[PDB]
Amino acid sequence: MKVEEILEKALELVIPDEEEVRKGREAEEELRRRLDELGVEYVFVGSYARNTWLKGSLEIDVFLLFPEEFSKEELRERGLEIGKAVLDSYEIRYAEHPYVHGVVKGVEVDVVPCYKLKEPKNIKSAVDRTPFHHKWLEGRIKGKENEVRLLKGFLKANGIYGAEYKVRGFSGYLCELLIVFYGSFLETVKNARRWTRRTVIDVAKGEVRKGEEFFVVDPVDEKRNVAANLSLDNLARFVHLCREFMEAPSLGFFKPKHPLEIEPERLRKIVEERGTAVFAVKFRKPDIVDDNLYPQLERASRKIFEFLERENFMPLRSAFKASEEFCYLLFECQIKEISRVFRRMGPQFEDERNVKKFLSRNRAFRPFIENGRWWAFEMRKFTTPEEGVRSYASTHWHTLGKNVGESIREYFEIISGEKLFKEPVTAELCEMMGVKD
Amino acid sequence: MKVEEILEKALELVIPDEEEVRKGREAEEELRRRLDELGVEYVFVGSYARNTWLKGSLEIDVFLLFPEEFSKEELRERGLEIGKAVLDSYEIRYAEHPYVHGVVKGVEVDVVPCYKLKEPKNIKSAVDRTPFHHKWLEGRIKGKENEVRLLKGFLKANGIYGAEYKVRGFSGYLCELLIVFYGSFLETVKNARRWTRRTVIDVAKGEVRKGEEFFVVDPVDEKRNVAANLSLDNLARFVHLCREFMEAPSLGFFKPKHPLEIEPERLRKIVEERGTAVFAVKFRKPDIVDDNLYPQLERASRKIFEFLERENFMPLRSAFKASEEFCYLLFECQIKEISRVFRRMGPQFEDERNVKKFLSRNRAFRPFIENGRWWAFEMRKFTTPEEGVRSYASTHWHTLGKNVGESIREYFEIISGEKLFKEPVTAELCEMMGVKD
Numbered sequence: 001m002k003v004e005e006i007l008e009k010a011l012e013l014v015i016p017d018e019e020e021v022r023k024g025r026e027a028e029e030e031l032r033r034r035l036d037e038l039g040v041e042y043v044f045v046g047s048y049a050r051n052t053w054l055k056g057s058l059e060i061d062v063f064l065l066f067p068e069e070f071s072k073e074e075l076r077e078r079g080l081e082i083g084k085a086v087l088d089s090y091e092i093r094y095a096e097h098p099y100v101h102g103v104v105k106g107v108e109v110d111v112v113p114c115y116k117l118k119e120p121k122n123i124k125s126a127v128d129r130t131p132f133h134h135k136w137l138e139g140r141i142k143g144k145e146n147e148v149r150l151l152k153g154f155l156k157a158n159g160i161y162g163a164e165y166k167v168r169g170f171s172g173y174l175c176e177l178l179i180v181f182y183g184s185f186l187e188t189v190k191n192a193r194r195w196t197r198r199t200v201i202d203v204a205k206g207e208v209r210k211g212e213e214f215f216v217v218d219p220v221d222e223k224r225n226v227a228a229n230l231s232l233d234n235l236a237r238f239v240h241l242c243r244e245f246m247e248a249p250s251l252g253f254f255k256p257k258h259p260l261e262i263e264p265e266r267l268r269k270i271v272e273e274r275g276t277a278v279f280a281v282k283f284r285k286p287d288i289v290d291d292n293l294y295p296q297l298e299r300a301s302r303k304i305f306e307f308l309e310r311e312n313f314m315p316l317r318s319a320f321k322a323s324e325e326f327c328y329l330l331f332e333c334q335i336k337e338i339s340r341v342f343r344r345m346g347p348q349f350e351d352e353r354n355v356k357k358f359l360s361r362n363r364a365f366r367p368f369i370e371n372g373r374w375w376a377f378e379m380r381k382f383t384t385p386e387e388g389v390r391s392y393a394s395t396h397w398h399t400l401g402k403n404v405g406e407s408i409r410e411y412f413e414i415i416s417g418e419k420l421f422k423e424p425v426t427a428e429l430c431e432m433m434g435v436k437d
Numbered sequence: 438m439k440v441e442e443i444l445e446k447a448l449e450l451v452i453p454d455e456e457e458v459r460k461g462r463e464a465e466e467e468l469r470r471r472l473d474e475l476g477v478e479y480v481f482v483g484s485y486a487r488n489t490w491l492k493g494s495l496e497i498d499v500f501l502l503f504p505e506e507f508s509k510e511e512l513r514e515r516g517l518e519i520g521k522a523v524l525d526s527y528e529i530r531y532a533e534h535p536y537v538h539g540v541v542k543g544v545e546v547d548v549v550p551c552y553k554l555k556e557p558k559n560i561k562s563a564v565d566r567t568p569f570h571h572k573w574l575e576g577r578i579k580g581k582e583n584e585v586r587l588l589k590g591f592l593k594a595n596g597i598y599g600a601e602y603k604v605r606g607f608s609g610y611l612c613e614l615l616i617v618f619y620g621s622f623l624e625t626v627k628n629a630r631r632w633t634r635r636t637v638i639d640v641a642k643g644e645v646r647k648g649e650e651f652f653v654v655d656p657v658d659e660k661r662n663v664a665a666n667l668s669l670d671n672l673a674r675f676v677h678l679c680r681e682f683m684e685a686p687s688l689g690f691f692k693p694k695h696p697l698e699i700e701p702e703r704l705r706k707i708v709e710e711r712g713t714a715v716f717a718v719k720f721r722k723p724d725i726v727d728d729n730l731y732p733q734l735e736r737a738s739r740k741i742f743e744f745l746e747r748e749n750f751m752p753l754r755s756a757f758k759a760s761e762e763f764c765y766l767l768f769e770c771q772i773k774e775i776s777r778v779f780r781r782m783g784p785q786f787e788d789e790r791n792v793k794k795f796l797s798r799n800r801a802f803r804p805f806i807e808n809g810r811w812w813a814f815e816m817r818k819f820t821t822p823e824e825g826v827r828s829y830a831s832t833h834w835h836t837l838g839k840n841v842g843e844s845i846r847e848y849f850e851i852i853s854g855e856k857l858f859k860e861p862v863t864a865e866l867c868e869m870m871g872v873k874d
């Protein structure tokens with residue numbers, strides 16, 4: 001519909017509506033009231049302060065700024081004291097060091113203790129960096145706030161906004177740096193078409209170069225990769241999306257697809273056509289935060305995938321899902337059944353002592369020499385991937401993540417067929433198999 | 438029964454019986470008569486001349502010895518003239534250059550034209566070497582002829598006597614050199630227990646050393662490996678047999694096992710227990726000699742094995758058989774059926790031009806990105822190893838040996854099940870699968 005027209009139309013999917021802006025205003029004003037009456041030194045930072053927050057994602061970030069000659073113990077204790085004093089309800093959270101999360105007039109707020117430092121290079125952790133992040137962007141981002149929201153909304157609609165482990169995508173700070181570097185959403189998208197996995201974007205130097213990994217240099221700290229948490233595959237997906245958008249721009253790129261909502265019969269038919277074994281490991285979700293859970297699910301899934309590969313079941317893809325009560329590790333394999341008999345490698349023929357040992361073992365079939373080496377026919381203890389995974393998960397749960405594996409130890413189920421389809425995983429199965437509309 | 442007693446008893450399985458020795462005598466005397474009346478210069482060589490021929494393997498080797506100033510054309514023409522003149526019936530054969538094979542008083546004879554040379558180093562091919570082979574052994578082998586027959590009979594009973602391609606074992610000349618080097622059958626067997634695939638036996642130097650390959654140095658020509666045609670696996674089998682013999686000597690080692698003679702029902706049951714796909718490629722035997730046929734069968738079998746491996750059917754072993762009218766390439770695979778769907782590798786995400794091409798193709802399922810690279814689900818044209826080989830043999834017969842592949846082009850059949858068992862291959866199947874008694 002013309003790119004410039006589509007971007008005009010996309011602003012309404014992306015700019016927060018009216019009662020959200022005022023809901024934030026009322027919370028901000030009230031929070032300021034309460035902080036001011038305590039005489040605390042503070043700064044509002046982040047996307048609220050800069051008016052770059054995406055529609056639906058209202059949250060306020062306040063950093064408490066303390067004298068440089070407070071101890072690290074003194075800053076944390078007093079910081080949490082104030083944190084608790086000014087929020088309606090509160091929780092003591094952790095990202096690297098403690099902060100307080102809570103609510104003010106219905107709006108989520110983080111209050112974070114850090115050092116007040118004139119000029120950086122006195123940084124200790126990411127915490128003390130953050131006031132400098134706001135400082136750097138405040139005023140470079142002025143007049144570009146809707147460009148930021150366009151980029152955020154584009155990424156969100158395509159499932160790659162957020163640096164948290166469940167997503168492994170683009171952080172808010174990364175988005176604002178990109179907008180400063182390229183000047184607009186449109187220019188970011190046009191240029192991202194030529195990004196590679198070796199692209200280094202150095203904002204402070206106005207420079208793009210090549211390096212070992214995709215790296216977006218923090219203009220406040222040259223050692224920090226702002227894009228650290230962006231996965232290789234989400235980078236690839238973004239580059240491709242940028243290419244697709246420019247070739248045929250549409251408002252559709254700013255709107256999430258409503259899920260496939262497939263009937264168990266159609267999935268049964270798809271699985272029949274592909275001729276694969278499709279199954280899931282079901283177990284109880286451990287009570288840990290997403291940033292801990294998701295890496296364990298990734299690990300568990302890979303270890304089982306690697307097991308299926310090693311055992312010659314020719315796994316195609318895996319996926320995973322956490323519902324409220326259960327987790328699911330999903331697998332599709334090209335082999336439904338393998339033979340009972342396999343080949344065990346023995347010693348080189350010269351090695352008399354070890355040959356004697358190899359041949360000592362009772363077997364149904366006679367060992368043979370092939371290419372200078374002994375081999376034996378021996379028998380598998382499982383012939384399907386489901387039987388294999390039942391054995392693996394029963395015996396090797398110690399390698400499936402601390403909490404995920406402990407859960408699997410207490411209870412797991414292998415589910416396939418019309419049964420697997422009853423679980424809340426059909427969406428994920430359809431994606432894994434590349435099912436079309 | 439005591440080793441020295443067993444060897445005494447083995448002499449009667451190995452020394453030619455009475456009417457064989459005299460049948461040879463009568464043929465030798467008659468051949469001498471006919472050669473002498475032509476005034477031809479000749480020498481009887483080989484195992485007949487040295488009284489080292491195994492029981493049942495009577496054949497006479499005569500080399501016609503010509504002046505050194507005959508041409509290579511003159512020696513071949515005149516050599517075949519005499520060859521034809523003195524044998525009862527004859528055929529013009531080929532090993533490297535032509536010779537005559539025929540019969541005298543019921544006994545097979547080869548007559549071979551070569552140069553009469555005083556001292557070697559004037560050799561042209563293997564042909565002119567052979568009089569020197571006899572010269573070297575005549576008299577070193579005296580009193581050791583029964584040691585040679587013991588070794589030959591031991592190897593024959595275990596299927597590894599003969600350097601021809603069907604066997605890839607030990608030649609007669611190799612056996613006699615071994616006896617000279619070690620002094621006896623028993624000492625050859627004791628010492629062969631420590632042979633490796635790098636063992637070099639240098640008869641003329643009285644030396645065993647290490648080298649790149651198993652090598653038995655011809656005492657008449659230091660560049661010639663007398664054991665050239667011995668396969669690695671037959672070497673391994675001999676070393677193992679030597680170890681087994683010394684641990685528990687028996688007359689059984691000089692007696693061929695009578696074949697397994699299995700019933701189709703028992704093989705059906707074995708195949709069921711193993712859970713494999715067992716099948717054969719049947720085609721008409723081309724009319725070529727064994728030394729040409731067997732390498733082609735080996736090649737055809739390997740190419741199809743490599744195909745089965747490449748196509749993820751997990752072949753265990755292969756074998757082959759030639760009957761009078763047909764050839765059979767036999768296979769056992771761990772996968773009976775693979776899924777319809779597989780994964781096709783596409784380009785790296787950066788490569789826009791090739792990504793566009795990869796994604797252009799119509800497919801039932803959507804391609805995906807994994808680890809920085811595109812992949813597509815696509816569909817196999819076969820899901821069993823039998824269907825795969827029908828396709829491979831139909832399309833790639835050009836790679837299955839000149840004559841074997843041409844035969845397969847005209848006609849082949851894939852056979853499995855109660856059908857495969859009707860063919861004269863059950864012996865070979867039982868060996869391939871390591872079936873016990």
Ligand SMILES: Nc1ccn([C@@H]2O[C@H](COP(=O)(O)OP(=O)(O)OP(=O)(O)O)[C@@H](O)[C@H]2O)c(=O)n1
Nearest residue numbers: 046047048053054061095126130133134172173
């Ligand atoms: N684990 C974290 C979380 C945040 N930050 C920093 O804290 C500030 C605010 O973080 P965040 O709320 O995630 O970013 P926003 O810009 O406010 O974006 P959003 O709208 O998604 O909240 C940023 O300067 C960021 O670099 C960080 O270093 N490490």
Ligand SMILES: Nc1ccn([C@@H]2O[C@H](COP(=O)(O)OP(=O)(O)OP(=O)(O)O)[C@@H](O)[C@H]2O)c(=O)n1
Nearest residue numbers: 302303304306307310392395396397398399400
């Ligand atoms: N490269 C590999 C990986 C493992 N395995 C086999 O698979 C088993 C499980 O390996 P893994 O899946 O990595 O599970 P862990 O519990 O991490 O391994 P382990 O029990 O040996 O500590 C191993 O014990 C080993 O016998 C193997 O043969 N070769």
Ligand SMILES: Nc1ccn([C@@H]2O[C@H](COP(=O)(O)OP(=O)(O)OP(=O)(O)O)[C@@H](O)[C@H]2O)c(=O)n1
Nearest residue numbers: 483484485490491498532563567570571609610
């Ligand atoms: N293709 C061949 C065949 C034979 N020879 C030589 O010809 C002679 C006789 O060969 P052969 O008949 O195979 O050996 P025998 O000692 O007579 O043993 P056998 O009892 O098996 O016939 C030997 O010196 C051997 O080295 C050769 O060089 N190349």
Ligand SMILES: Nc1ccn([C@@H]2O[C@H](COP(=O)(O)OP(=O)(O)OP(=O)(O)O)[C@@H](O)[C@H]2O)c(=O)n1
Nearest residue numbers: 739740741743744747829832833834835836837
């Ligand atoms: N290392 C290999 C071997 C072969 N193949 C595929 O398998 C086919 C057959 O290969 P081969 O069994 O070696 O048969 P040839 O007839 O010898 O090969 P070609 O038809 O390519 O000349 C090839 O065309 C190729 O597509 C492959 O992908 N990779």
Ligand SMILES: [Cl-]
Nearest residue numbers: 045046133134
């Ligand atoms: Cl910030």
Ligand SMILES: [Cl-]
Nearest residue numbers: 482483570571
């Ligand atoms: Cl000889």
Ligand SMILES: [Mg+2]
Nearest residue numbers: 059060061110
């Ligand atoms: Mg926040």
Ligand SMILES: [Mg+2]
Nearest residue numbers: 496497498547
């Ligand atoms: Mg001969």
Ligand SMILES: [Mn+2]
Nearest residue numbers: 046047059061
């Ligand atoms: Mn924020």
Ligand SMILES: [Mn+2]
Nearest residue numbers: 101102109110
């Ligand atoms: Mn919070």
Ligand SMILES: [Mn+2]
Nearest residue numbers: 395396398399
């Ligand atoms: Mn383990």
Ligand SMILES: [Mn+2]
Nearest residue numbers: 483484496498
């Ligand atoms: Mn001979």
Ligand SMILES: [Mn+2]
Nearest residue numbers: 538539546547
């Ligand atoms: Mn002959």
Ligand SMILES: [Mn+2]
Nearest residue numbers: 832833835836
């Ligand atoms: Mn081909």
Ligand code: NA
Nearest residue numbers: 391392394395
């Ligand atoms: Na187990």
Ligand code: NA
Nearest residue numbers: 828829831832
């Ligand atoms: Na074909």
